[PDB]
Amino acid sequence: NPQTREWQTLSGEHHLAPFSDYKQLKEKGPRIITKAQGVHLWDSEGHKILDGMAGLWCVAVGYGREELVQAAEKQMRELPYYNLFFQTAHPPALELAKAITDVAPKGMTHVFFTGSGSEGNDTVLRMVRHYWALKGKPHKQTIIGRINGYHGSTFAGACLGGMSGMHEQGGLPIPGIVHIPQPYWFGEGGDMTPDEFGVWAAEQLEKKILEVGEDNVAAFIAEPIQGAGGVIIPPETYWPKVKEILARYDILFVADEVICGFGRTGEWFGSDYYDLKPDLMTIAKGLTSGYIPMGGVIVRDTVAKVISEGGDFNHGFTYSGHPVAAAVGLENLRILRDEKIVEKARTEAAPYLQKRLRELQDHPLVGEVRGLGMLGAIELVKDKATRSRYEGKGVGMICRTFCFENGLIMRAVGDTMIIAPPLVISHAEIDELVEKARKCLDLTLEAIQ
Amino acid sequence: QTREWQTLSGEHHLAPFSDYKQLKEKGPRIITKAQGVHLWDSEGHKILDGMAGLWCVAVGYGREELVQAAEKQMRELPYYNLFFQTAHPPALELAKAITDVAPKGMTHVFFTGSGSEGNDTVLRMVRHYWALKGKPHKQTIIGRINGYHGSTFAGACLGGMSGMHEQGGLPIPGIVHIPQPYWFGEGGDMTPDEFGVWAAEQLEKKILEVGEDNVAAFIAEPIQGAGGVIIPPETYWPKVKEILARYDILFVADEVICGFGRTGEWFGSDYYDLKPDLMTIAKGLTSGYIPMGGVIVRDTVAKVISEGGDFNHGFTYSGHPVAAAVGLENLRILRDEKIVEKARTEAAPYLQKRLRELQDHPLVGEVRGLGMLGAIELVKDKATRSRYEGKGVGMICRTFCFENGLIMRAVGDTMIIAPPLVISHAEIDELVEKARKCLDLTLEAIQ
């Protein structure tokens, strides 16, 4: 009603939002978020809203940490920008690279800097193929991804992931990208027990290697826990089985830690969680807690032999290792580490979140509650034993809409409700979430039957 | 210690467009401070920055208005996404700002983090747009040799650097390249004007080759940047326009470099009175103080809205609120403090004059420049426009240029400048003085 309407007519006439139906957006008008603090935020109509998604999986330390505001201001005044092209560097970017590598697994010794996760996965793509072409195998290009995996919205990042909705937009794909099925027991694994589905899903990797040809396979790319396509937590058997395959074949492993990176699963990385030894690690989001745009790729020492016969690695972006972004990053890692936010997430926040969320198991609508560290998903079903869904209907969108109106951001991927709140969420704020969540699950159920 | 920071780079950093083995043997040059158009290294050496970082620091280093715009926004609202049918005030009012300085009918902005992400955005957009209009077969993008459009997979395709095409495997289907209008190096014994016509007509050749009904768009920078400042002959763009009218394809102007005051006008599209459909932007949007890019979209091409359904595209940090505030505040300064106007009227003619007095120098084949762009051709023979085969003339100047406190870059044997728009006549004096000295030193090192 107040200034909202002015901002709303503007969006309609001048703005094109990510992943949106702009015709619809205009008929409703978007919701404007203006302020935020802690884990909460306010819309232009004064409604306080608990943010259970941490913006978009990125605001790790929560909203309003002034340490980062001052880290930025100082850097921006002293040196706002200088490129990393001209055989040149600046202190932020170097000491950040050092910080990341220290919290990264054994042998993750290098960082190539990008502005986003998407630009990160582009970086992996040109890297992996260059790496093989350097090793004398330029035919070896094919990347194995997965259905319902997300890896970016660049051309490369959309072609690497397995969203059909994206593949339909942008024309003929990049040659040399193929997809195996996702280890989503709940929705895909029919009458199999979780454990044996995880083995099935893992062995499909070996199927695809032998199909395409080992000597044609450049890398396997996967998120440790898929994010955008629901929080598809794998069966226990999946990663261990996958590791056994990886050892036998001579291809690179790419862990997309964009979401899993920096405390989301209780550990620093998902690769730490499932004791994975990747070659490359996509990162973004929580690197700077989203206070400033930044992404990157963490590179294993052995792969970083691109240095040798590195007849220039003709890659990079203007704002690679942007000094203001690096200061915010460096300062962010100090807080995460020294104030023991990741440690507090694993020990204090996560078990409390997992408990209070799994008491929604009883609710008529809930087929399953699954979650790990500061990830959590709730399956909405028509029948718990069959794991069936309400064909069309749009159950998930209904919850989401209630969830919003009762001051909760908990997002819907199909009929899977999702959360991934800031790591610094207090037991009280966790109470607030679960309370609101139950109310909206009740309201949802009412709206069907 | 520099040395400490240098051994670090070696052990932990992979810099853009660099030979990391070499980088380690030398150690990189670390930049710590800057002010105005100048910069300091960790050894205390002052250096005039003739490239504005990387074509981006329009208003120059040290403008506190932007530091405060950031701080305020970061405190109030550090981030919120634009995915969840959600928005925030910065991004909306910035979109409005840009559209106002953009040519007639440029009414919309899709936000990205870089120019590369911008060109990815154009690619998915253009093909979706045609698929929406009932022609999903219509995908082919026409670019140009020595054109630069990004370092994403899409952006490295799209552009015509061979060095990039050799890295990343088989290209994206439906991208073809016509020749660049670089008279000085390519044109031979044609007069500039007739080369520009030749180069332009090669577009029509490619349309008819591939098939109109297969052609989605032509993509070009108004003035190529990364591949030297290839200022086109006067005839090129006018000729190109005449082709564009006759055929049913989209025009994509990559204003990443040309955008926001670099050619005296707001855009190169304003300079050459072009009516594009889509406009790639970045760099000067936020004067590079904070990472941001985007795509400006013509009203009619916003038919992606109708029937479109979801446009399944975008990045987490699309329209990042801190970045937008710095952007909005940056546009206010550019506009209201008349920096673009001062660039055209006061800075540019002075820069163009003082730079073209290097025409006389034995090594200089040509001096060309426009607004706050400038290039100097280094030759072995002025009349033939020949080069010192290999030798690496350009890299020699660059190295002198650095050691005598000037950032003037080398693309092959073309010295390049594009300094901040706010450069004073005094600082322009400083550049040209240093430039002559290094051209002298260069010549000494060869012949």
Tab-separated table of N, CA, C and O in Angstrom, chain A residues 368-404:
chain	number	residue	atom	x	y	z
A	368	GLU	N	8.011	-37.985	5.630
A	368	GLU	CA	9.373	-38.116	6.128
A	368	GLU	C	9.865	-36.747	6.590
A	368	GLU	O	9.450	-35.717	6.068
A	369	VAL	N	10.738	-36.754	7.597
A	369	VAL	CA	11.581	-35.611	7.885
A	369	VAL	C	13.020	-36.107	7.831
A	369	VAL	O	13.364	-37.068	8.507
A	370	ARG	N	13.829	-35.469	6.986
A	370	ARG	CA	15.256	-35.743	6.910
A	370	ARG	C	16.010	-34.421	6.989
A	370	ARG	O	15.524	-33.392	6.509
A	371	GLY	N	17.205	-34.476	7.581
A	371	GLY	CA	18.044	-33.297	7.671
A	371	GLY	C	19.430	-33.667	8.173
A	371	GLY	O	19.616	-34.706	8.796
A	372	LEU	N	20.390	-32.792	7.899
A	372	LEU	CA	21.777	-33.018	8.253
A	372	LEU	C	22.413	-31.676	8.574
A	372	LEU	O	22.219	-30.721	7.835
A	373	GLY	N	23.135	-31.590	9.689
A	373	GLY	CA	23.673	-30.317	10.133
A	373	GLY	C	22.604	-29.227	10.062
A	373	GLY	O	21.590	-29.334	10.737
A	374	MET	N	22.819	-28.228	9.196
A	374	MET	CA	21.908	-27.110	9.051
A	374	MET	C	21.178	-27.200	7.719
A	374	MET	O	20.868	-26.169	7.122
A	375	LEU	N	20.926	-28.442	7.284
A	375	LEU	CA	20.018	-28.745	6.185
A	375	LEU	C	18.807	-29.508	6.731
A	375	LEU	O	18.922	-30.243	7.713
A	376	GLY	N	17.648	-29.349	6.085
A	376	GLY	CA	16.443	-30.046	6.515
A	376	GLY	C	15.361	-30.052	5.436
A	376	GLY	O	15.110	-29.031	4.785
A	377	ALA	N	14.717	-31.219	5.271
A	377	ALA	CA	13.639	-31.382	4.307
A	377	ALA	C	12.466	-32.137	4.927
A	377	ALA	O	12.661	-33.038	5.741
A	378	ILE	N	11.251	-31.758	4.512
A	378	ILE	CA	10.022	-32.399	4.956
A	378	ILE	C	9.243	-32.853	3.723
A	378	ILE	O	8.825	-32.017	2.921
A	379	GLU	N	9.020	-34.169	3.603
A	379	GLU	CA	8.266	-34.717	2.486
A	379	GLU	C	6.768	-34.657	2.792
A	379	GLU	O	6.318	-35.157	3.819
A	380	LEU	N	6.008	-34.053	1.869
A	380	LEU	CA	4.562	-33.970	1.973
A	380	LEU	C	3.949	-35.034	1.061
A	380	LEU	O	4.224	-35.079	-0.134
A	381	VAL	N	3.099	-35.887	1.643
A	381	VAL	CA	2.617	-37.080	0.962
A	381	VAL	C	1.105	-37.196	1.113
A	381	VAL	O	0.508	-36.594	2.001
A	382	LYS	N	0.520	-38.010	0.233
A	382	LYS	CA	-0.874	-38.415	0.318
A	382	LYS	C	-1.003	-39.714	1.110
A	382	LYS	O	-2.051	-39.970	1.695
A	383	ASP	N	0.053	-40.540	1.103
A	383	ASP	CA	0.049	-41.806	1.817
A	383	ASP	C	1.476	-42.145	2.241
A	383	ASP	O	2.347	-42.279	1.387
A	384	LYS	N	1.693	-42.317	3.553
A	384	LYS	CA	3.027	-42.454	4.121
A	384	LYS	C	3.691	-43.759	3.682
A	384	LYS	O	4.891	-43.782	3.411
A	385	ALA	N	2.912	-44.847	3.620
A	385	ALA	CA	3.459	-46.174	3.379
A	385	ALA	C	3.877	-46.352	1.920
A	385	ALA	O	4.890	-46.999	1.662
A	386	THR	N	3.086	-45.805	0.978
A	386	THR	CA	3.401	-45.857	-0.444
A	386	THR	C	4.343	-44.724	-0.845
A	386	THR	O	4.927	-44.780	-1.924
A	387	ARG	N	4.460	-43.691	0.004
A	387	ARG	CA	5.229	-42.485	-0.281
A	387	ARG	C	4.641	-41.733	-1.477
A	387	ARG	O	5.360	-41.062	-2.213
A	388	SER	N	3.319	-41.806	-1.644
A	388	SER	CA	2.649	-41.177	-2.771
A	388	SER	C	2.539	-39.663	-2.571
A	388	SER	O	2.736	-39.161	-1.463
A	389	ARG	N	2.209	-38.955	-3.659
A	389	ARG	CA	2.077	-37.505	-3.674
A	389	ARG	C	0.680	-37.128	-4.148
A	389	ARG	O	0.000	-37.950	-4.744
A	390	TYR	N	0.274	-35.880	-3.912
A	390	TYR	CA	-0.991	-35.391	-4.440
A	390	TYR	C	-0.818	-34.893	-5.873
A	390	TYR	O	-0.858	-33.685	-6.102
A	391	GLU	N	-0.706	-35.824	-6.834
A	391	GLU	CA	-0.811	-35.537	-8.268
A	391	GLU	C	-1.254	-34.099	-8.566
A	391	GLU	O	-2.388	-33.710	-8.290
A	392	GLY	N	-0.361	-33.316	-9.179
A	392	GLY	CA	-0.633	-31.911	-9.440
A	392	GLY	C	-0.883	-31.175	-8.127
A	392	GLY	O	0.030	-31.018	-7.325
A	393	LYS	N	-2.132	-30.761	-7.913
A	393	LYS	CA	-2.568	-30.051	-6.713
A	393	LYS	C	-1.654	-28.879	-6.353
A	393	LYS	O	-2.149	-27.782	-6.112
A	394	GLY	N	-0.344	-29.137	-6.229
A	394	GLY	CA	0.638	-28.118	-5.910
A	394	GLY	C	0.778	-27.929	-4.399
A	394	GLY	O	0.927	-26.811	-3.938
A	395	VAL	N	0.745	-29.038	-3.657
A	395	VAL	CA	0.797	-29.040	-2.205
A	395	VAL	C	1.937	-28.156	-1.708
A	395	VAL	O	1.752	-27.359	-0.785
A	396	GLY	N	3.128	-28.326	-2.303
A	396	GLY	CA	4.328	-27.644	-1.839
A	396	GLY	C	4.189	-26.127	-1.901
A	396	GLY	O	4.600	-25.418	-0.984
A	397	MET	N	3.588	-25.645	-2.994
A	397	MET	CA	3.376	-24.224	-3.223
A	397	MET	C	2.378	-23.654	-2.213
A	397	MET	O	2.431	-22.472	-1.900
A	398	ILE	N	1.461	-24.506	-1.735
A	398	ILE	CA	0.434	-24.115	-0.779
A	398	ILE	C	1.098	-23.883	0.577
A	398	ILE	O	0.866	-22.853	1.200
A	399	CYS	N	1.916	-24.839	1.034
A	399	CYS	CA	2.666	-24.704	2.276
A	399	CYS	C	3.509	-23.419	2.221
A	399	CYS	O	3.363	-22.515	3.047
A	400	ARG	N	4.341	-23.321	1.177
A	400	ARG	CA	5.193	-22.160	0.991
A	400	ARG	C	4.403	-20.876	1.237
A	400	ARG	O	4.877	-19.989	1.933
A	401	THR	N	3.219	-20.764	0.634
A	401	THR	CA	2.435	-19.542	0.669
A	401	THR	C	1.933	-19.264	2.087
A	401	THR	O	1.972	-18.115	2.531
A	402	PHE	N	1.438	-20.302	2.776
A	402	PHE	CA	1.113	-20.187	4.190
A	402	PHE	C	2.380	-19.808	4.953
A	402	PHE	O	2.396	-18.827	5.692
A	403	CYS	N	3.439	-20.599	4.748
A	403	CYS	CA	4.728	-20.395	5.398
A	403	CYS	C	5.149	-18.927	5.339
A	403	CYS	O	5.569	-18.384	6.346
A	404	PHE	N	5.012	-18.291	4.169
A	404	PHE	CA	5.339	-16.878	4.008
A	404	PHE	C	4.442	-16.016	4.890
A	404	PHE	O	4.943	-15.204	5.670
